PDB file of C-alpha atoms and ligand atoms in Angstrom:
ATOM      1  CA  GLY V   1      10.681 -70.776 -17.577  1.00  0.00           C
ATOM      2  CA  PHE V   2       8.510 -70.273 -20.628  1.00  0.00           C
ATOM      3  CA  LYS V   3       5.857 -72.853 -19.739  1.00  0.00           C
ATOM      4  CA  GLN V   4       5.560 -71.363 -16.287  1.00  0.00           C
ATOM      5  CA  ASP V   5       5.368 -68.047 -18.057  1.00  0.00           C
ATOM      6  CA  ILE V   6       2.429 -69.340 -19.789  1.00  0.00           C
ATOM      7  CA  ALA V   7       0.849 -70.266 -16.779  1.00  0.00           C
ATOM      8  CA  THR V   8       1.462 -67.046 -15.082  1.00  0.00           C
ATOM      9  CA  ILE V   9      -0.122 -64.847 -17.793  1.00  0.00           C
ATOM     10  CA  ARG V  10      -2.971 -67.345 -18.256  1.00  0.00           C
ATOM     11  CA  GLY V  11      -3.698 -66.965 -14.416  1.00  0.00           C
ATOM     12  CA  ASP V  12      -4.343 -63.323 -14.674  1.00  0.00           C
ATOM     13  CA  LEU V  13      -5.017 -63.125 -18.372  1.00  0.00           C
ATOM     14  CA  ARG V  14      -7.029 -59.865 -18.521  1.00  0.00           C
ATOM     15  CA  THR V  15      -4.754 -57.899 -16.596  1.00  0.00           C
ATOM     16  CA  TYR V  16      -1.287 -59.076 -18.034  1.00  0.00           C
ATOM     17  CA  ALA V  17      -3.090 -58.481 -21.469  1.00  0.00           C
ATOM     18  CA  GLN V  18      -4.120 -55.002 -20.990  1.00  0.00           C
ATOM     19  CA  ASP V  19      -0.637 -54.019 -19.166  1.00  0.00           C
ATOM     20  CA  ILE V  20       1.461 -55.346 -21.917  1.00  0.00           C
ATOM     21  CA  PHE V  21      -1.067 -54.164 -24.758  1.00  0.00           C
ATOM     22  CA  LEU V  22      -0.608 -50.567 -23.248  1.00  0.00           C
ATOM     23  CA  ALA V  23       3.020 -50.938 -22.621  1.00  0.00           C
ATOM     24  CA  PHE V  24       3.118 -51.553 -26.614  1.00  0.00           C
ATOM     25  CA  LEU V  25       1.010 -48.427 -27.432  1.00  0.00           C
ATOM     26  CA  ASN V  26       3.066 -46.361 -24.814  1.00  0.00           C
ATOM     27  CA  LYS V  27       6.521 -47.418 -26.391  1.00  0.00           C
ATOM     28  CA  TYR V  28       4.944 -47.120 -29.850  1.00  0.00           C
ATOM     29  CA  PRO V  29       2.339 -44.433 -30.005  1.00  0.00           C
ATOM     30  CA  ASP V  30       1.862 -44.463 -33.823  1.00  0.00           C
ATOM     31  CA  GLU V  31       0.811 -47.945 -33.633  1.00  0.00           C
ATOM     32  CA  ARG V  32      -2.496 -46.683 -31.737  1.00  0.00           C
ATOM     33  CA  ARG V  33      -3.563 -45.694 -35.653  1.00  0.00           C
ATOM     34  CA  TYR V  34      -4.663 -49.080 -36.089  1.00  0.00           C
ATOM     35  CA  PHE V  35      -7.185 -49.230 -33.095  1.00  0.00           C
ATOM     36  CA  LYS V  36      -9.198 -46.133 -34.063  1.00  0.00           C
ATOM     37  CA  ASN V  37     -11.589 -46.532 -31.143  1.00  0.00           C
ATOM     38  CA  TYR V  38      -8.585 -46.248 -28.580  1.00  0.00           C
ATOM     39  CA  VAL V  39      -7.369 -43.134 -29.954  1.00  0.00           C
ATOM     40  CA  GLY V  40      -7.503 -40.115 -27.602  1.00  0.00           C
ATOM     41  CA  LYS V  41      -8.760 -42.377 -24.692  1.00  0.00           C
ATOM     42  CA  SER V  42      -7.366 -42.597 -21.340  1.00  0.00           C
ATOM     43  CA  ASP V  43      -6.239 -46.069 -19.973  1.00  0.00           C
ATOM     44  CA  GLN V  44      -9.185 -45.975 -17.389  1.00  0.00           C
ATOM     45  CA  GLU V  45     -11.571 -44.678 -20.375  1.00  0.00           C
ATOM     46  CA  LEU V  46     -10.270 -47.723 -22.495  1.00  0.00           C
ATOM     47  CA  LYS V  47     -10.975 -50.059 -19.353  1.00  0.00           C
ATOM     48  CA  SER V  48     -14.789 -48.885 -19.101  1.00  0.00           C
ATOM     49  CA  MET V  49     -14.959 -50.066 -22.867  1.00  0.00           C
ATOM     50  CA  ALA V  50     -16.046 -53.544 -22.961  1.00  0.00           C
ATOM     51  CA  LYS V  51     -14.136 -54.295 -26.333  1.00  0.00           C
ATOM     52  CA  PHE V  52     -11.039 -52.939 -25.052  1.00  0.00           C
ATOM     53  CA  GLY V  53     -11.003 -55.705 -22.500  1.00  0.00           C
ATOM     54  CA  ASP V  54     -12.802 -58.228 -24.463  1.00  0.00           C
ATOM     55  CA  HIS V  55     -10.500 -57.982 -27.687  1.00  0.00           C
ATOM     56  CA  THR V  56      -7.113 -57.662 -25.377  1.00  0.00           C
ATOM     57  CA  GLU V  57      -7.956 -61.004 -23.501  1.00  0.00           C
ATOM     58  CA  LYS V  58      -8.931 -62.617 -26.650  1.00  0.00           C
ATOM     59  CA  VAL V  59      -5.535 -61.476 -28.421  1.00  0.00           C
ATOM     60  CA  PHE V  60      -3.474 -62.854 -25.389  1.00  0.00           C
ATOM     61  CA  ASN V  61      -5.513 -65.829 -24.934  1.00  0.00           C
ATOM     62  CA  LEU V  62      -4.721 -66.680 -28.977  1.00  0.00           C
ATOM     63  CA  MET V  63      -0.845 -65.682 -28.191  1.00  0.00           C
ATOM     64  CA  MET V  64      -0.836 -68.108 -25.151  1.00  0.00           C
ATOM     65  CA  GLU V  65      -2.050 -70.997 -27.315  1.00  0.00           C
ATOM     66  CA  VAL V  66       0.516 -70.529 -29.975  1.00  0.00           C
ATOM     67  CA  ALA V  67       3.222 -70.118 -27.215  1.00  0.00           C
ATOM     68  CA  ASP V  68       1.860 -73.360 -25.585  1.00  0.00           C
ATOM     69  CA  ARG V  69       1.773 -75.195 -28.931  1.00  0.00           C
ATOM     70  CA  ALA V  70       5.402 -74.292 -29.731  1.00  0.00           C
ATOM     71  CA  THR V  71       8.437 -76.645 -29.178  1.00  0.00           C
ATOM     72  CA  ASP V  72      11.388 -74.840 -27.637  1.00  0.00           C
ATOM     73  CA  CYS V  73       9.657 -71.364 -28.713  1.00  0.00           C
ATOM     74  CA  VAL V  74       9.575 -72.526 -32.370  1.00  0.00           C
ATOM     75  CA  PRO V  75       5.762 -71.656 -33.281  1.00  0.00           C
ATOM     76  CA  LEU V  76       3.662 -73.744 -35.586  1.00  0.00           C
ATOM     77  CA  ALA V  77       3.658 -72.561 -39.198  1.00  0.00           C
ATOM     78  CA  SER V  78      -0.261 -73.149 -38.980  1.00  0.00           C
ATOM     79  CA  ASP V  79      -0.469 -70.805 -35.978  1.00  0.00           C
ATOM     80  CA  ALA V  80       1.599 -68.031 -38.120  1.00  0.00           C
ATOM     81  CA  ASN V  81      -0.659 -68.594 -40.870  1.00  0.00           C
ATOM     82  CA  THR V  82      -3.813 -68.097 -38.774  1.00  0.00           C
ATOM     83  CA  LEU V  83      -2.365 -64.687 -37.656  1.00  0.00           C
ATOM     84  CA  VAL V  84      -1.383 -63.678 -41.172  1.00  0.00           C
ATOM     85  CA  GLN V  85      -4.766 -64.288 -42.955  1.00  0.00           C
ATOM     86  CA  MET V  86      -6.896 -62.822 -40.144  1.00  0.00           C
ATOM     87  CA  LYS V  87      -8.757 -60.051 -41.849  1.00  0.00           C
ATOM     88  CA  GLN V  88      -7.825 -57.768 -38.875  1.00  0.00           C
ATOM     89  CA  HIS V  89      -4.216 -58.082 -39.803  1.00  0.00           C
ATOM     90  CA  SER V  90      -4.462 -57.578 -43.633  1.00  0.00           C
ATOM     91  CA  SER V  91      -2.589 -54.204 -43.459  1.00  0.00           C
ATOM     92  CA  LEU V  92       0.073 -55.444 -40.951  1.00  0.00           C
ATOM     93  CA  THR V  93       3.832 -56.222 -41.262  1.00  0.00           C
ATOM     94  CA  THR V  94       6.042 -58.274 -39.319  1.00  0.00           C
ATOM     95  CA  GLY V  95       7.827 -55.028 -38.027  1.00  0.00           C
ATOM     96  CA  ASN V  96       4.161 -54.626 -36.220  1.00  0.00           C
ATOM     97  CA  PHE V  97       4.547 -57.995 -34.607  1.00  0.00           C
ATOM     98  CA  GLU V  98       8.219 -57.201 -33.561  1.00  0.00           C
ATOM     99  CA  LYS V  99       7.430 -54.091 -31.677  1.00  0.00           C
ATOM    100  CA  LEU V 100       4.719 -55.767 -29.660  1.00  0.00           C
ATOM    101  CA  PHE V 101       7.240 -58.447 -28.665  1.00  0.00           C
ATOM    102  CA  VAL V 102      10.354 -55.932 -27.999  1.00  0.00           C
ATOM    103  CA  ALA V 103       7.377 -54.132 -25.480  1.00  0.00           C
ATOM    104  CA  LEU V 104       6.375 -57.556 -24.168  1.00  0.00           C
ATOM    105  CA  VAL V 105      10.192 -58.342 -23.458  1.00  0.00           C
ATOM    106  CA  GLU V 106      10.663 -54.856 -21.876  1.00  0.00           C
ATOM    107  CA  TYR V 107       7.617 -55.274 -19.695  1.00  0.00           C
ATOM    108  CA  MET V 108       8.650 -58.655 -18.312  1.00  0.00           C
ATOM    109  CA  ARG V 109      12.199 -57.344 -17.617  1.00  0.00           C
ATOM    110  CA  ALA V 110      10.982 -54.032 -15.773  1.00  0.00           C
ATOM    111  CA  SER V 111       8.296 -56.525 -13.789  1.00  0.00           C
ATOM    112  CA  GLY V 112       8.796 -57.560 -10.090  1.00  0.00           C
ATOM    113  CA  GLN V 113       9.004 -61.179 -11.588  1.00  0.00           C
ATOM    114  CA  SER V 114      10.981 -64.053 -12.896  1.00  0.00           C
ATOM    115  CA  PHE V 115       9.850 -64.119 -16.403  1.00  0.00           C
ATOM    116  CA  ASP V 116      11.897 -65.991 -18.988  1.00  0.00           C
ATOM    117  CA  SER V 117      12.397 -62.867 -21.137  1.00  0.00           C
ATOM    118  CA  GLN V 118      15.130 -64.459 -23.239  1.00  0.00           C
ATOM    119  CA  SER V 119      12.523 -67.030 -24.237  1.00  0.00           C
ATOM    120  CA  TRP V 120       9.881 -64.585 -25.076  1.00  0.00           C
ATOM    121  CA  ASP V 121      12.289 -62.592 -27.345  1.00  0.00           C
ATOM    122  CA  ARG V 122      13.328 -65.905 -29.011  1.00  0.00           C
ATOM    123  CA  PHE V 123       9.680 -66.590 -29.522  1.00  0.00           C
ATOM    124  CA  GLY V 124       8.916 -63.204 -30.923  1.00  0.00           C
ATOM    125  CA  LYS V 125      12.025 -63.641 -33.215  1.00  0.00           C
ATOM    126  CA  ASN V 126      10.820 -67.218 -34.341  1.00  0.00           C
ATOM    127  CA  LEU V 127       7.082 -65.930 -34.814  1.00  0.00           C
ATOM    128  CA  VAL V 128       8.271 -63.037 -36.989  1.00  0.00           C
ATOM    129  CA  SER V 129       9.959 -65.617 -39.227  1.00  0.00           C
ATOM    130  CA  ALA V 130       7.221 -67.917 -39.473  1.00  0.00           C
ATOM    131  CA  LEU V 131       4.829 -64.793 -40.195  1.00  0.00           C
ATOM    132  CA  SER V 132       7.347 -63.648 -43.157  1.00  0.00           C
ATOM    133  CA  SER V 133       7.071 -67.401 -44.677  1.00  0.00           C
ATOM    134  CA  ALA V 134       3.267 -67.373 -44.443  1.00  0.00           C
ATOM    135  CA  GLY V 135       3.497 -64.408 -46.772  1.00  0.00           C
ATOM    136  CA  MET V 136       3.469 -61.250 -44.316  1.00  0.00           C
ATOM    137  CA  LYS V 137       5.414 -58.233 -45.822  1.00  0.00           C
TER     138      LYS V 137
HETATM  139  C1  HEM F   1       1.001 -62.425 -31.848  1.00  0.00           C
HETATM  140  C2  HEM F   1       0.381 -61.635 -31.704  1.00  0.00           C
HETATM  141  C3  HEM F   1      -1.139 -61.219 -31.936  1.00  0.00           C
HETATM  142  C4  HEM F   1      -2.191 -62.024 -31.670  1.00  0.00           C
HETATM  143  C5  HEM F   1      -2.060 -63.363 -31.056  1.00  0.00           C
HETATM  144  C6  HEM F   1      -3.189 -61.425 -32.355  1.00  0.00           C
HETATM  145  C7  HEM F   1      -4.740 -61.677 -32.132  1.00  0.00           C
HETATM  146  C8  HEM F   1      -5.661 -61.081 -32.489  1.00  0.00           C
HETATM  147  C9  HEM F   1      -7.113 -61.527 -32.291  1.00  0.00           C
HETATM  148  C10 HEM F   1      -7.324 -62.962 -31.640  1.00  0.00           C
HETATM  149  C11 HEM F   1      -7.814 -60.693 -32.801  1.00  0.00           C
HETATM  150  C12 HEM F   1      -9.404 -60.707 -32.718  1.00  0.00           C
HETATM  151  C13 HEM F   1      -9.670 -60.187 -31.080  1.00  0.00           C
HETATM  152  C14 HEM F   1     -11.409 -60.151 -31.001  1.00  0.00           C
HETATM  153  O1  HEM F   1     -12.135 -59.902 -32.012  1.00  0.00           O
HETATM  154  O2  HEM F   1     -11.943 -60.187 -29.926  1.00  0.00           O
HETATM  155  C15 HEM F   1      -6.785 -59.392 -33.024  1.00  0.00           C
HETATM  156  C16 HEM F   1      -7.539 -58.557 -33.537  1.00  0.00           C
HETATM  157  C17 HEM F   1      -6.494 -57.286 -34.004  1.00  0.00           C
HETATM  158  N1  HEM F   1      -5.616 -57.357 -34.045  1.00  0.00           N
HETATM  159 FE1  HEM F   1      -4.310 -58.688 -33.652  1.00  0.00          FE
HETATM  160  N2  HEM F   1      -2.958 -60.188 -32.741  1.00  0.00           N
HETATM  161  C18 HEM F   1      -1.578 -60.129 -32.558  1.00  0.00           C
HETATM  162  C19 HEM F   1      -0.762 -59.125 -32.952  1.00  0.00           C
HETATM  163  C20 HEM F   1      -1.236 -57.695 -33.435  1.00  0.00           C
HETATM  164  C21 HEM F   1      -0.346 -56.584 -33.904  1.00  0.00           C
HETATM  165  C22 HEM F   1       0.897 -56.352 -33.618  1.00  0.00           C
HETATM  166  C23 HEM F   1      -1.289 -55.762 -34.380  1.00  0.00           C
HETATM  167  C24 HEM F   1      -1.166 -54.071 -34.972  1.00  0.00           C
HETATM  168  C25 HEM F   1      -0.035 -53.426 -34.304  1.00  0.00           C
HETATM  169  C26 HEM F   1      -2.840 -56.393 -34.442  1.00  0.00           C
HETATM  170  C27 HEM F   1      -3.702 -55.749 -34.553  1.00  0.00           C
HETATM  171  C28 HEM F   1      -5.066 -56.175 -34.540  1.00  0.00           C
HETATM  172  C29 HEM F   1      -6.055 -55.294 -34.844  1.00  0.00           C
HETATM  173  C30 HEM F   1      -6.374 -53.909 -35.317  1.00  0.00           C
HETATM  174  C31 HEM F   1      -7.166 -56.056 -34.597  1.00  0.00           C
HETATM  175  C32 HEM F   1      -8.777 -55.726 -34.772  1.00  0.00           C
HETATM  176  C33 HEM F   1      -9.217 -54.750 -33.739  1.00  0.00           C
HETATM  177  C34 HEM F   1     -10.384 -54.814 -33.247  1.00  0.00           C
HETATM  178  O3  HEM F   1     -11.640 -54.854 -33.782  1.00  0.00           O
HETATM  179  O4  HEM F   1     -10.627 -54.526 -31.878  1.00  0.00           O
HETATM  180  N3  HEM F   1      -2.488 -57.499 -33.755  1.00  0.00           N
HETATM  181  N4  HEM F   1      -5.815 -59.753 -33.147  1.00  0.00           N
HETATM  182  O1  5JC F   2      -7.411 -55.978 -28.387  1.00  0.00           O
HETATM  183  C1  5JC F   2      -5.817 -55.964 -28.689  1.00  0.00           C
HETATM  184  C2  5JC F   2      -4.805 -56.051 -28.120  1.00  0.00           C
HETATM  185  C3  5JC F   2      -3.591 -56.093 -28.654  1.00  0.00           C
HETATM  186  C4  5JC F   2      -3.432 -56.251 -29.939  1.00  0.00           C
HETATM  187 CL1  5JC F   2      -2.031 -56.575 -30.922  1.00  0.00          CL
HETATM  188  C5  5JC F   2      -4.522 -56.120 -30.942  1.00  0.00           C
HETATM  189  C6  5JC F   2      -5.744 -55.929 -30.332  1.00  0.00           C
HETATM  190 CL2  5JC F   2      -7.033 -55.944 -31.135  1.00  0.00          CL
END
């Protein structure tokens, strides 16, 4: 279920984080504009860049913390507020977050694996509502 999925992802965080983030940029290539140092770089060039692995791992570490603190895939308002008030997220809208979660669920459905992809879709929908409520356009 969702709790096991958090354990699965955490066990190999850097690989899942890189694979899901690339799946996101591949599905929505205009989103790469927010990551100016990743434009025009192949996947293997990205993996040679320290900050690509560091910043993907830390994004997914936080995502897993927010997922773990949720009740029945409903995140804490405090965690939504953290994501809205981050300087790095100042120009984002809830649509950016929805795209990441559409890509994450598509990755889980395409994987070998028994992810609870309905729960990740729900968690994403609930996190979008919490982000709006915390003031994200
Ligand atoms: C639940 C979803 C997300 C979480 C948990 C999250 C978390 C984070 C974290 C922890 C950082 C700082 C990483 C570090 O300094 O090492 C970060 C930076 C950033 N995030 Fe997010 N983020 C999320 C979604 C998004 C989305 C949807 C976008 C844009 C489409 C975005 C754009 C960025 C950008 C541009 C940075 C700074 C890039 C950099 O300096 O490397 N994030 N995010
Ligand atoms: O390194 C990252 C991976 C995913 C997302 Cl959404 C943002 C950042 Cl900075």
